[PDB]
């Protein structure tokens, strides 16, 4: 009897096709109401806030509705004289780190059958050697007929694949996992029966919550995968077996008063493990700035066993002071790192990087923040990349992301929680270790209509480099790429041609999806990176930008920033049509299918 109040969920179904790191969602639920009276159904799933929502689907015994995607103003016009936000009425907001919840609740008829159907899509991001699929299961009813299906295909061939699922007992998942991989081709089928899925022999509440895990990763043996497919390309670029580059590190960490407590403890903590991890040949110093900046050397000392000591020491020792001069920190921290072209030309061929941690904002000395971005990317010019890590939520996210992006870095949130010094660890592990520097992937300007960031600062061991485009007509045949790049004293060079047999069959052994997945791949990261220049522009080049954004959000069908998808042909107790957007940083459905005329 899975049945609750006559309402059973007959199936709930999860299908992940990846092509060549682009992954495919699609969610299907049906929902039975087996009562005389109408019953209340619900569709809650959550989903990564790096997707973007390409398609919806409801249908209820027959009556189908669909989610239109238009510009966001647009499908936002019914809440300006409504007394709900937008905000508040929207069917997705974020619910954690990396993941938002999808949640509607509709009324169906009785003796009705309605099938719910989410598509949503994401070019997966290597780190830690691996690909990562999460997918979270929580029906919160036991399933007659539930799976979760993952069909990966890469062209490069997969070495690795593995399925995890923490809420299942070790000798249950074994059964009910089935997973296998041979050349391009790997599966994983997660198919529990209805008794797998209770948490007692007979009892009727389910153990099906947690997450599904997939981890995978492709053969990097040849350092070329080039994928072309109609007048389209992707580009991988992550070679193995390189030697690691000796970096200079510099630390710049806030000791305000705000620190006090766990977020000072757990940074610590993060330090004495960083440090203890460091290799013979790096080179670093730290910056501490509250009111006050103070430098532990000076200038970058090697990490011999003496120095990481007595780093270690001065880790566990220092103590808060008050307010925060984060300009004075940020350009003592540059300063020591500038020293190797004047003072310490030894370690000219060495990686630089610059890290900055706050829990806060600049509040002593220099604080117009757009003052500090001119002074920080004018004093780095483009020697090494800052990463700049915003501990807690009070403070000015958005300053250190554009910071970063204008110094050839990135931004990363470290979550007050009890975990705090493994998210820290985590990041500095992305880029603990530089192979490569001033990475130039160059194409024939020729076939060339449009491409992605195809410069990079750094590549890290366990990350990769992908640059997609479009190719102009008739230039597809004879394209190439070129990547140029430095390593410790060296030269990096080669040449990729496409495999035009390989792309026929590449073609015949995937289908034409692998085309559409690979124009797909490239308006995603296309998109993305729209978003991301438009917030480090000046207001009038941003609207260009932004106009750029909701064009191609449209042609692909993808919620983002800029659109949302609405459903016509249902509405709430205030008429109020079902609104789909993606969130920044109750009500409850029946079918209705009249609105007033204009």
């Given at each position: 009897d899975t049945a609750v109040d006559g309402v059973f969920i007959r199936s709930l179904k999860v299908n992940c096709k990846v092509t060549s790191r682009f992954a495919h969602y699609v969610v299907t639920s049906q929902v039975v109401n087996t009562a005389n009276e109408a019953r209340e159904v619900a569709f809650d799933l959550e989903i990564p806030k790096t997707a973007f929502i390409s398609d919806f689907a409801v249908t209820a015994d027959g009556n189908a509705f669909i989610g239109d995607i238009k510009d966001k103003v647009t499908a936002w016009?019914?809440?300006?004289?409504?007394?709900?936000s937008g905000e508040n009425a929207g069917l997705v907001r974020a619910s954690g780190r990396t993941m938002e919840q999808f949640t509607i609740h509709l009324t169906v008829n009785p003796q009705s059958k309605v099938t719910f159907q989410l598509t949503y899509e994401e070019v997966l991001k290597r780190n830690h050697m691996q690909y990562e699929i999460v997918i979270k299961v929580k029906p919160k009813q036991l399933v007659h007929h539930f799976e979760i299906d993952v069909d990966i295909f890469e062209p490069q061939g997969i070495s690795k694949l593995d399925a995890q699922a923490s809420f299942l007992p070790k000798e249950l998942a074994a059964q009910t996992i089935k997973k296998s991989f041979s050349g391009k081709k790997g599966h994983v089928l997660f198919r529990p029966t209805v008794s797998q899925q209770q948490?007692?022999?007979?009892?009727?509440?389910?153990?099906?919550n947690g997450h599904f895990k997939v981890t995978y990763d492709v053969s990097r043996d040849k350092i070329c995968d080039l994928l072309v497919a109609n007048n389209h390309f992707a580009h991988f670029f992550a070679p193995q077996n390189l030697t690691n580059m000796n970096k200079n590190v510099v630390f710049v960490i806030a000791i305000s008063?705000?620190?006090?407590?766990?977020k000072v403890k757990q940074t610590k903590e993060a330090l004495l493990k960083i440090l203890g991890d460091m290799q013979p040949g790096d080179y670093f110093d730290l910056v501490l700035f509250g009111t006050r900046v103070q430098s532990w050397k000076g200038s970058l000392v090697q990490a011999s066993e003496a120095n990481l000591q007595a780093a270690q020491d001065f880790v566990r020792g220092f103590s808060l002071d008050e307010a925060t001069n984060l300009n004075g920190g940020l350009l003592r921290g540059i300063e020591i790192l500038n020293?190797?072209?004047?003072?310490?030309?030894?370690?000219?061929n060495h990686a630089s990087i610059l890290i900055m941690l706050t829990d806060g904002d600049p509040?002593?000395?220099?604080?117009?923040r757009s003052q500090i971005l001119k002074n920080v990317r004018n004093a780095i010019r483009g020697r090494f990349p800052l990463y700049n890590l915003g501990f807690?939520?009070?403070?000015?996210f958005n300053f250190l992301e554009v910071m970063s992006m204008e110094n050839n870095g990135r931004a990363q949130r470290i979550y007050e929680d009890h975990d705090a010094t493994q998210q820290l660890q985590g990041f500095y592990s992305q880029v603990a270790?530089?192979?490569?520097?001033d990475v130039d992937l160059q194409y024939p300007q020729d076939a060339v209509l449009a491409l992605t960031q195809?410069?990079?600062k750094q590549y890290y061991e366990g990350s990769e480099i992908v640059v997609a485009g479009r190719i102009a007509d008739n230039?597809?045949?004879?394209f190439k790429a070129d990547v140029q790049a430095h390593g410790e004293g060296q030269e990096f060079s080669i040449t990729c041609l496409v495999d035009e047999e390989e792309m026929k069959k590449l073609l015949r052994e995937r289908g034409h999806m692998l085309e559409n997945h690979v124009e797909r791949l490239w308006a995603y990261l296309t998109i993305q990176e729209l978003l991301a220049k438009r917030m480090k522009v000046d207001r009038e080049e941003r609207a260009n930008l932004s106009s750029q954004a909701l064009q191609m959000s449209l042609d692909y069908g993808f919620v983002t920033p800029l659109t949302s998808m609405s459903i016509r042909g249902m509405a709430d107790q205030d008429g109020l049509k079902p609104t789909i957007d993606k969130p920044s940083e109750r009500r409850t459905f029946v079918l209705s299918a009249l609105q007033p005329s204009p």
């Open positions: 016009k019914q809440y300006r004289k409504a007394a709900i948490s007692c022999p007979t009892c009727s509440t389910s153990l099906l008063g705000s620190m006090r407590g766990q020293q190797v072209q004047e003072s310490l030309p030894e370690l000219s509040t002593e000395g220099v604080t117009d807690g939520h009070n403070v000015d270790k530089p192979l490569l520097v195809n410069h990079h230039k597809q045949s004879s």
